[PDB]
Amino acid sequence: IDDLIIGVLFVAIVETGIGGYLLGSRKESGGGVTKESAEKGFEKIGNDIQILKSSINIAIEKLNDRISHDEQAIRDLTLEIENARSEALLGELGIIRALLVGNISIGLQESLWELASEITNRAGDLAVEVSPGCWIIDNNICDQSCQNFIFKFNETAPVPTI
Amino acid sequence: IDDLIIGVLFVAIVETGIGGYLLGSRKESGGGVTKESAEKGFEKIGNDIQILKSSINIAIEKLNDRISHDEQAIRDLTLEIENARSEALLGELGIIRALLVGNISIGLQESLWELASEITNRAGDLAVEVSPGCWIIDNNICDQSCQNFIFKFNETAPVPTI
Amino acid sequence: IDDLIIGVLFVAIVETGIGGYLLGSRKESGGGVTKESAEKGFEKIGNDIQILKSSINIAIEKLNDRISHDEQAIRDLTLEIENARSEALLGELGIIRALLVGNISIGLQESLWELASEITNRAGDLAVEVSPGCWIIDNNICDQSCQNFIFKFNETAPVPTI
Amino acid sequence: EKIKICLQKQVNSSFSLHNGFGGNLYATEEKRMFELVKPKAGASVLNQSTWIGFGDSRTDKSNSAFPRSADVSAKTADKFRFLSGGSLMLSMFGPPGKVDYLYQGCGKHKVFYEGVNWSPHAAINCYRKNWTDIKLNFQKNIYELASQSHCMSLVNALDKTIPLQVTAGTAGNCNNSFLKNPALYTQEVKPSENKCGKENLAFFTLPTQFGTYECKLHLVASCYFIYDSKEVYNKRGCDNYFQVIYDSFGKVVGGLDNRVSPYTGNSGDTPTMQCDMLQLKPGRYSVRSSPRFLLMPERSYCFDMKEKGPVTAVQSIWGKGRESDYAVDQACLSTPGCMLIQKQKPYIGEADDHHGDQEMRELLSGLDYEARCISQSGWVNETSPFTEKYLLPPKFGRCPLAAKEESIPKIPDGLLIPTSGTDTTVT
Amino acid sequence: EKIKICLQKQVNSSFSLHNGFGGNLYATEEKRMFELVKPKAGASVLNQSTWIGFGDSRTDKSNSAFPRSADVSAKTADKFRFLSGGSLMLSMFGPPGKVDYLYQGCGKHKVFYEGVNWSPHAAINCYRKNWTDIKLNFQKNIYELASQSHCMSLVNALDKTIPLQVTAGTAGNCNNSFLKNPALYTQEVKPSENKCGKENLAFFTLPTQFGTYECKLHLVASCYFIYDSKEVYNKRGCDNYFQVIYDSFGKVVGGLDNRVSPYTGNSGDTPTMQCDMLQLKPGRYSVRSSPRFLLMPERSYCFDMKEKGPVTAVQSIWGKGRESDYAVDQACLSTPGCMLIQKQKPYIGEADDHHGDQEMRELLSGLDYEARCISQSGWVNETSPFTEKYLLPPKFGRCPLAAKEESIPKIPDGLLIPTSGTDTTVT
Amino acid sequence: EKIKICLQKQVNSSFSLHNGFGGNLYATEEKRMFELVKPKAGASVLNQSTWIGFGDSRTDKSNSAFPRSADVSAKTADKFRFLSGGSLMLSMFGPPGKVDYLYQGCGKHKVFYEGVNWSPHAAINCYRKNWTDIKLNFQKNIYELASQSHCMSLVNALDKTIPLQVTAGTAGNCNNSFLKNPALYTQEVKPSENKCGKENLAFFTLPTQFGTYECKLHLVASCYFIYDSKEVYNKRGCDNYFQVIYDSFGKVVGGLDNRVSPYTGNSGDTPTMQCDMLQLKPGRYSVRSSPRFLLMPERSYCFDMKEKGPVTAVQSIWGKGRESDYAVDQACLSTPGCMLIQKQKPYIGEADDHHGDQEMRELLSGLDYEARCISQSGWVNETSPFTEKYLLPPKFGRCPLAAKEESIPKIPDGLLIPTSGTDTTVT
Ligand SMILES: *[C@@H]1O[C@H](CO)[C@@H](O[C@@H]2O[C@H](CO)[C@@H](O[C@@H]3O[C@H](CO)[C@@H](O)[C@H](O)[C@@H]3O)[C@H](O)[C@H]2NC(C)=O)[C@H](O)[C@H]1NC(C)=O
Ligand SMILES: *[C@@H]1O[C@H](CO)[C@@H](O[C@H]2O[C@H](CO)[C@@H](O[C@H]3O[C@H](CO)[C@@H](O)[C@H](O)[C@@H]3O)[C@H](O)[C@H]2NC(C)=O)[C@H](O)[C@H]1NC(C)=O
Ligand SMILES: *[C@@H]1O[C@H](CO)[C@@H](O[C@H]2O[C@H](CO)[C@@H](O[C@H]3O[C@H](CO)[C@@H](O)[C@H](O)[C@@H]3O)[C@H](O)[C@H]2NC(C)=O)[C@H](O)[C@H]1NC(C)=O
Ligand SMILES: *[C@@H]1O[C@H](CO)[C@@H](O[C@H]2O[C@H](CO)[C@@H](O[C@H]3O[C@H](CO)[C@@H](O)[C@H](O)[C@@H]3O)[C@H](O)[C@H]2NC(C)=O)[C@H](O)[C@H]1NC(C)=O
Ligand SMILES: *[C@H]1O[C@H](CO)[C@@H](O[C@@H]2O[C@H](CO)[C@@H](O[C@@H]3O[C@H](CO)[C@@H](O)[C@H](O)[C@@H]3O)[C@H](O)[C@H]2NC(C)=O)[C@H](O)[C@H]1NC(C)=O
Ligand SMILES: *[C@H]1O[C@H](CO)[C@@H](O[C@@H]2O[C@H](CO)[C@@H](O[C@@H]3O[C@H](CO)[C@@H](O)[C@H](O)[C@@H]3O)[C@H](O)[C@H]2NC(C)=O)[C@H](O)[C@H]1NC(C)=O
Ligand SMILES: *[C@H]1O[C@H](CO)[C@@H](O[C@@H]2O[C@H](CO)[C@@H](O[C@@H]3O[C@H](CO)[C@@H](O)[C@H](O)[C@@H]3O)[C@H](O)[C@H]2NC(C)=O)[C@H](O)[C@H]1NC(C)=O
């Protein structure tokens, strides 16, 4: 990863800490590594997560039963068969399942990169973007005000001139 | 997204406008958002698209019939069965279909990123590359001539050294 | 592609040259394009490759036989059937196979991007990172010593501006 | 300034890691791809227009106290061909007084809910005290043949020719006449005065067709008298008892020949009748018997053997008070193709003690909907491909498979965080 | 100075959005993954070296006017075992004058195209005016046994023993002799002068083997005379007519015994012959009959029962002029395993009015290629796994399945534009 | 300074390019997804608690020289029901002196390893010199009925009634008495002095049940004497030989009637006994025969027909010295459901020349483990879904399929280098 506030490349595993998408900030002459969520930036991810979760339903519903049509009049037991038929159909389902999770995963990440671009596209002052997802602004030029504008998005004390 | 011209991340939906891969340019003190294709840069994508489309044929041809071998001598109707067997094989095909489209999709995009890198790798003068796929050059240093060299590729009037 | 030495985006095909992951360096006033492996950086990729290869075993073992249970007492030959059943199960296996290769591929690359970030996260002096995987440092500021620190990793003769 | 903002992905303990092909996902919740399905107990069908039922009174739509007396809805009763007081078996032998109904009809799926009307209670005895066994076998064949024909119909009368020495017979036990199917016939014979009749020979013809109905196979009853022994038989009979049914050529297809088989009765001085179920191709058969008695077959059920199909058989019993039997049950369970429907609780009817039992109603309610599958384990109209317990053998349609709830695949839900490559996830 | 270039992805209306696993695609065109396949009408085979045909003349390669007279190519004719003017049925009974050809051979798939040669036209009558029914049943068995054996052969003569009172018989209707299979035999008997012959008993032996051919099962014809009634029979016969075939033990396997079954004729003073098809295991059988006539079986078709296989039967009729029959058709359609080939248009031959009809030719052309599948609905040598209409029941091989053209999956084509993540697509 | 570093991906010749869905991989090594599986030769089972065996001595745990004499382990022997010197066939006819063991038991899978004890060597002859054929047919049925029942048991005695003229018979060839199953019976009759006995009639009853065991079907042996000819028969007999078994009605179910079938013997002055295998439903049967001899059936094997199941039959022969036979072999291979186990090398026992052969041991070793599949081609307990050669027909379980080693899919191994998009790969 990277120190303690890793980019959009890795993922922090803190068994007992907060969880979710959040803003990890840290200064060079500081020990306090602030972690905080910007529910205004999340606004995208969150909605996209929905759009994503929505797809599953479809595709799952879409599974037009790879299920057999029977005309079993005979009375002999077939569990050894029914069982094996099931173990298979189960397996078939598993793969197409992973197929969904992966797609989501892919689309979600590709969607976190959508934020960066958008955040990066928010000033040449910011425009430090070191590693992907991480950037280093100068609070001498970028006071909290724009930091909040840049990220969180309060729309107050940003960028006029033009 | 962004203004009238977005990056290699999004895709413009203009129900009645031109369509395809093209160069979207716009100045800061300008209302005219020029859109135009650079059939010389396309030269890659286009060919790669072919290569890509080529694969389908193979993989599709490759579908070695998950089709059953029958020895049905009895005369009883089996439509309810044939039907269910078909609904399934259809389903199986669908997934492996999406599998192809996605792969293509993936490879195509990954191929659009191949252009950027290549275009970006065309000057420290250009080297503005803001968001992925989008860059801001200064026509005072980069007159049309190199713009055309940078992108379109006419091979006349550009360079930063040798 | 990037001249004689490209980034983490492309892959060099040298039918008879060295092979693997390596460090490709080249100066602007130099014809010698040094290629050399940094077995200390590889240390990650290599281990990850293991972790990756490990997964296959699982998922393959995981293939709970989409294999049929028979009660064939009749003696008639069924090769035309057994054969077709096999050609299919073979096909089913193929897809879930590509499924594995691609996942590996994806995770491996995503893992090479893990290095960049990490290497990039090693100085504002380095922090030239042009194209992904490629960076241009100034040996006047970054002598071999740090170059080796930056990449290879000998942990001797850095430069903290603090 | 020297800050650092980062879109961070953080996962705590309320997480779970679903792995996928080409990237994974951490999630707060998870759910099943499909839900386990329970089979609805009772009887149902598919196509709704490919089924037909043969009825009692509990199915008789044209019965006085209707809705009340019924065990089924009207919609359902419409698809039934019943008539109060009837029984396929009753029509088979046409005992005296008891209702004789022409059961017949077609359908890919046949639903039987008759029989109670000739239970031990009926106390019919025409030389036979306990008819259950016969009921059993009769039912057994009806179901078999029924599960292989598309159409079936009672054949209430067939072309026959009876000899002259013999004349129609009536019996004490048989109220004061006799059954309609095994038809009694007799001739004056007194051994004492050494007057033994003329061994009789009579013919009979199973038709190829009976009205619309095509008969590829006939179910007829071969009956005969079981005497305790010669002398006993010799009390009213002259040599050795025997009744045999030969086919076009002298091949025998049924009967009892005491001239070669031993006497096995134990009913004292009067015989007992035994009725075997026979499946006969259509044609001209003949029967030969000892002078005194002739039990001529004169009816049958006729089946084309056009096509295979399911068969549901509902158990038929009395409410408490009268004696019932499980011939039906036994029979259904002992023949491939039919599914038996049974009650757990006893019968208590609305119209009266014997008609309109709740259980039965919610049991045969399924006959109104179209199921996805039907089994001896119940039916299901839902759509998931899995169920907790293995559905039972005679089953038709797209039946779900048995699978442990756990073992079914899980879908990520709630908060989703995409994982990247390998060691992407760091502590 | 302050410009902005961008590789843009733009999609108008001529688009379409194919979604996929891990990224989508917008496209200008689209096409089906597979094409629906039509079945080629007619007959074909698989393996081409595992099939054999039994022929007519329309198949007879060694026929005078060849190419012309044929309904098949040479390549095909080579695989056929025919001989002008023949018919399995003709060889079965060997009527007088008509060609008697030894049909026999092996094959996993047997193709029959014979029969016309003994159609009503043939106007043969050896105590029987309308042979069609028999043709029907005969064909029916040939096909059945054929679809279960690998090898089959006519057995032109079998070990038999005829009594002395009886002597070879000749008949008026039978040109002036008799059939070869049901073999007439008679003995002088005049009831008037009270001279009834000696009831006869004769034996006959179905062989276990016949040359190369192994016989696990024999198809023999059990025949007998059908008299209108006793007195009529008693005109030329003495007691009651009867002919019966018993097996090793006295079990009966066939015949007619008018001593127990009624007389059912209606041809006036002369009888009618009836021939039943019988399947008999190899062995020594015997027959018993009323003195005057004895119809001794003396030929049969022998089948090993080695293995199951397909059977194609081509309809056999005359061009216009002479009366034809559909026994073949009827029979094929009524037996599992064989596929019937029929013409829509009538027969008009090239060689002459009855040989070399166009339709038939393009019908039996398939016999020259190797199909992927063959059904009662036609054959197909193409490779897609789907077809518009459900292929008919008797079918063998890798048959495509029915599916609506629409329902089959679509492949993106033309201009492809990769879609990125979620809201990637914007106006 | 004006340098340029780059993380480079370079691939030489020791490469290989595995392509995948959504990105490819170059690799230095490669391996198979699954390995081809070989079938372990010999016999094994599944469930280990659903199988039972019927034994010899080579399976007899309670035999003197145990471990040595055995062809199986103790674990296995435990599951066997054997007794030194026995044979299902021996118990069937109970010949004199030879051990008569009550074989019976239940199991979903039955393993037979008996028979050698009544091989040509046994030199038993009770009116029959070469018993092999009978052995063959007897075995053939045991296997058939065994593969359809769950339980089976010898029925060592059945309710019968023998006439008074006849009295128990003893024979020269039969040591000095007779077989226990076909039971001889005779009556003084001298044709010369014109004293022909009384044609006899005797009954016998196949039981519906025999102890725990339910009998749905009985295997009985119908036997009779084969005489060379009348006069020869007429030497000691009076009219024409015959023995017939009729069923409840006079239907015949077996035997030989020389009053209608020809004499076929060739053993000179004394007859030869022929024993047919008959499957009879339970009931009261009767037999009729010429006065002098009566071969009354008095034993049988009884099978419920409860359920289908596999059957393994191990070949039974002598070590060198004594003559053996392949009836078993033949029979197994000629019946659906049983798998035959045979030795390639001869028999050489440890205990002595005829007990404890190595090959057999490593053959029947599988009976100790639980296989994933068992076939006539061998068994396998491994897990891959593929094998080099097609497993043979009678096979049960999850059997692997045939596939060329090459054709199975390959997994990348060693050094992996991810490929990007299209022309990503540049040389
Ligand atoms: C000679 O005998 C043959 C067979 O006994 C007769 O052929 C059969 O003729 C009848 C009437 O022509 C056909 O049956 C009819 O079928 C149609 C439709 O399937 C139906 O509408 C009628 O009610 C009746 O069932 C039957 O198909 C036909 N069989 C064959 C194989 O041709 C023939 O009529 C007799 N010829 C003479 C001159 O008596
Ligand atoms: C596709 O490739 C994925 C990697 O990107 C597979 O995943 C694997 O990698 C993760 C890391 O994100 C492993 O997580 C750790 O914990 C698990 C505990 O279960 C260990 O097994 C593992 O070694 C790591 O220490 C995942 O375990 C590992 N696989 C799984 C299934 O968890 C992903 O599985 C793969 N997709 C498919 C369909 O195989
Ligand atoms: C993998 O995941 C993809 C998302 O990254 C799926 O795609 C989707 O693309 C868009 C965005 O989710 C969906 O659009 C829906 O909403 C818009 C609202 O403007 C509607 O106009 C549109 O009709 C949809 O309702 C797509 O629908 C969705 N595609 C599908 C097929 O659901 C992608 O499909 C998924 N992979 C697979 C194989 O499904
Ligand atoms: C998913 O998409 C991949 C691209 O991202 C597919 O790949 C394809 O592209 C390569 C080039 O990288 C093709 O290579 C062809 O050209 C070379 C060089 O001339 C030949 O050596 C080679 O034989 C090919 O003709 C690949 O062939 C092509 N497909 C394949 C299967 O190799 C990738 O295949 C695709 N995945 C699936 C499962 O189809
Ligand atoms: C680590 O994981 C998540 C991080 O979000 C924590 O669980 C979540 O806790 C929040 C509390 O802020 C829950 O929010 C609640 O949402 C409901 C609506 O759903 C709202 O009505 C309540 O007022 C409240 O805001 C959220 O639902 C919950 N999600 C789950 C899946 O548990 C968890 O507690 C975190 N642990 C730590 C130590 O932060
Ligand atoms: C919206 O986008 C679609 C896709 O590009 C446009 O359709 C395209 O129209 C062009 C016309 O310039 C076609 O190109 C021409 O094709 C001919 C082929 O004979 C060629 O000779 C010309 O040199 C030229 O390349 C193109 O094929 C066609 N593509 C498709 C898939 O239909 C459409 O015109 C756009 N709408 C608007 C208003 O621009
Ligand atoms: C291009 O292909 C491979 C790329 O690795 C080169 O062969 C490789 O050679 C090395 C030794 O130089 C092999 O190493 C082997 O294992 C360990 C190190 O992993 C080492 O201690 C052993 O002594 C052993 O050599 C490596 O596995 C091997 N791989 C293959 C596929 O051969 C090959 O030499 C390269 N071509 C050129 C011209 O360099």
DSSP F137-169: HHHHHHHHHHTT-SEEEEE----EE--SS-EE-
Maximal CA-CA distance, chain E: 139
Question: Are D70 and D421 in contact, with CB atoms under 8 Å apart?
Answer: no
Task: Provide residues with CB under 6 Å of ligand 2.
Answer: A 98; C 51, 55, 59, 103, 107; D 19-21, 24, 419, 421-422, 425
3-state SS class at C34? coil
The rounded radius of gyration (Å) of the Cα atoms in chain B is: 24
Distance from the Cα of D20 to chain E's closest Cα (Å) equals 11
Interchain CB distance below 8 Å, C64 and A102: no
Question: Are D386 and A86 in contact, with CB atoms under 8 Å apart?
Answer: yes
Cα–Cα distance list, F85 to E53, F100, F352, F356 (Å): 55, 9, 15, 15
Instruction: Dig out the tokens for E46 from the structure.
Output: 């698989």
Instruction: Dig out the tokens for E255 from the structure.
Output: 């015949």
What's the residue count for chain F?
427
Dihedral (CA of E167, E168, E173, E179) sign: positive
CA-based nearest residue to D71, from D37, D106, D42, D29: D42
Dihedral (CA of D11, D16, D19, D22) sign: negative
Question: Are D14 and A13 in contact, with CB atoms under 8 Å apart?
Answer: no
What's the residue count for chain C?
162
Which own/partner contact pairs does A119-126 have at CB distance under 8 Å and 24+ positions apart? A119/A41, A119/A150, A119/A151, A119/D5, A119/D7, A120/B130, A120/B131, A121/B2, A121/B130, A121/B131, A122/A149, A122/A150, A123/A150, A123/A159, A126/A150
* DSSP string across D129-188: S--HHHHHHHHHHHHHHHTT-SEEEEE----EE--SS-EE--BSSSTTB--SSSB-EE--
Residue among C84, C92, C94 minimizing CB distance to B67: C84
* Residue C118 touches partner D, C-beta closer than 8 Å: no
Instruction: Dig out the tokens for E185 from the structure.
Output: 């035999």
User: Within 13 Å, how many C-alpha atoms sit on residue C26's CB side?
Assistant: 16
Angle, CA E261 vertex, CA E260 and CA E267 arms, to 5°: 135
Q: Sort strands D217-226 and D17-18 into parallel, antiparallel or unpaired.
A: unpaired
DSSP H helices in A8-150? 42-62, 79-120, 144-150
Contact A55 CB / ligand 3 (< 6 Å): yes
Atom of ligand 6 at shortest distance to CA of B20?
A: 5
What are φ and ψ of residue E89, in 5° steps? -65, -30
The rounded radius of gyration (Å) of the Cα atoms in chain E is: 31
- Per residue, the 3-state secondary structure of chain E, as one string, reads CCCCEEEEEEECCCCCEECCCCCCEEEEEEEECCCCCCCECCCCECCCCCEEEECCCCCCCCCCCHHHHCCCCHHHHHCEECCCCCCHHHHHHCCCCCCCCCCEEECCEEEECCCHHHCHHHCCCCCCCCCHHHHHHHHHHHHHHHCCCCEEEEECCCCEECCCCCEECCECCCCCECCCCCECEECCCECCCCECCCCEEEEEEECCEECCEECCEEEEEEEEEECCCHHHHHHHCCCCCEEEEECCCCCEEEEEECCCCCCCCCCCCCCEEEEEEEEECCEEEEEEECCCECCECCCEEEECCCCCCCEEEECCCCCCCCCCCCHHHHHHHCCCCEEEECCCCCCCCCCECCECCHHHHHHHHHHHCECCEEECCEEECCCCCEECCCCCCCEEECCCEECCCCCCCEEEEEEEEECCCCCCEEC
Instruction: Dig out the tokens for E265 from the structure.
Output: 């004729």
Residue among D21, D161, D250 minimizing CB distance to E260: D250
Residue A50: how many other CB atoms lie within 10 Å: 11
Buried b (16+ CB within 10 A) or exposed e, C27-66: eeeeeeeebeebeebbebbeebbeebeeebeebbeebebb
Strands (E) across F43-190 are located at 51-54, 80-81, 104-106, 109-112, 151-155, 160-161, 167-168, 185-186
CA dihedral of E144, E146, E150, E156, whole degrees rounded to 10: 130
What's the residue count for chain D?
427
* Whole-angstrom distance, CA of residue F324 vs CA of residue F119: 5
3-state SS class at F366? helix
Distance from the Cα of C107 to chain F's closest Cα (Å) equals 9
- CA D234 vs. chain centroid, Å, equals 41
Question: Are E263 and E318 in contact, with CB atoms under 8 Å apart?
Answer: no
Question: Are E363 and E40 in contact, with CB atoms under 8 Å apart?
Answer: no
Question: Is F153 known to be catalytic?
Answer: no
CA-based nearest residue to F231, from F189, F274, F265: F265
Q: Sort strands E109-112 and E51-54 into parallel, antiparallel or unpaired.
A: parallel
Residue of D nearest to B75 (CA): D307
Question: Tokens 């276990």 — which residue?
Answer: E208
* Whole-angstrom distance, CA of residue C45 vs CA of residue C39: 10
C1-162 under CATH 3.40.50.300, yes or no? no
Question: Tokens 């036209």 — which residue?
Answer: E121
B window 47-76, beta carbon within 8 A of D: 76
3-state SS class at B160? coil
* Whole-angstrom distance, CA of residue E194 vs CA of residue E212: 51
**Structural method:** X-ray
* Residue C71 touches partner B, C-beta closer than 8 Å: no
* Whole-angstrom distance, CA of residue D393 vs CA of residue A72: 7
Q: Ligand 6 pocket check: which of B15, B16, B18 to mutate, most ligand atoms within 8 Å of Cβ?
A: B18
D123: left (phi over 0), alpha (psi -120 to 50) or beta: left
* Whole-angstrom distance, CA of residue E394 vs CA of residue E372: 14
What's the residue count for chain E?
427
* Whole-angstrom distance, CA of residue E173 vs CA of residue F296: 52
CA-based nearest residue to C133, from C8, C5, C4, C1: C8
* Whole-angstrom distance, CA of residue F177 vs CA of residue D120: 54
Question: Is F353 known to be catalytic?
Answer: no
Domains and CATH numbers, chain D: 15-35+404-419 (2.20.70.20), 36-403 (no CATH)
* Whole-angstrom distance, CA of residue F247 vs CA of residue F287: 9
Q: Which residues contact C2 (CB under 8 A, 6 or more apart)?
A: B117, B121, C10, C131, C134, F6
The rounded radius of gyration (Å) of the Cα atoms in chain D is: 31
CA-based nearest residue to F87, from F306, F313, F298: F313
Interchain CB distance below 8 Å, C134 and F6: yes
* Whole-angstrom distance, CA of residue E242 vs CA of residue E263: 10
- CA A27 vs. chain centroid, Å, equals 26
Distance from the Cα of A31 to chain B's closest Cα (Å) equals 32
Cα–Cα distance list, C146 to C122, C158, D291 (Å): 10, 5, 125
* Residue B10 touches partner F, C-beta closer than 8 Å: no
Contact B18 CB / ligand 6 (< 6 Å): yes
* Whole-angstrom distance, CA of residue A19 vs CA of residue D15: 8
Question: Are B80 and A69 in contact, with CB atoms under 8 Å apart?
Answer: yes
Instruction: Dig out the tokens for F343 from the structure.
Output: 């030795």
CA dihedral of E301, E304, E308, E314, whole degrees rounded to 10: -20
* Whole-angstrom distance, CA of residue F53 vs CA of residue F79: 6
Domain parsing of chain C, residue ranges? 1-162
F23: left (phi over 0), alpha (psi -120 to 50) or beta: left
The rounded radius of gyration (Å) of the Cα atoms in chain C is: 24
Q: Which residues contact E49 (CB under 8 A, 6 or more apart)?
A: none
* Whole-angstrom distance, CA of residue D372 vs CA of residue C130: 62
* Whole-angstrom distance, CA of residue E393 vs CA of residue E386: 16
Residue A4: how many other CB atoms lie within 10 Å: 11
Residue of D nearest to E257 (CA): D249
Task: Provide residues with CB under 6 Å of ligand 4.
Answer: B 51, 55, 59, 103, 107; C 98; F 19-21, 24, 419, 421-422, 425
Q: Sort strands B70-72 and E395-397 into parallel, antiparallel or unpaired.
A: antiparallel
Amino acid D80 reads F
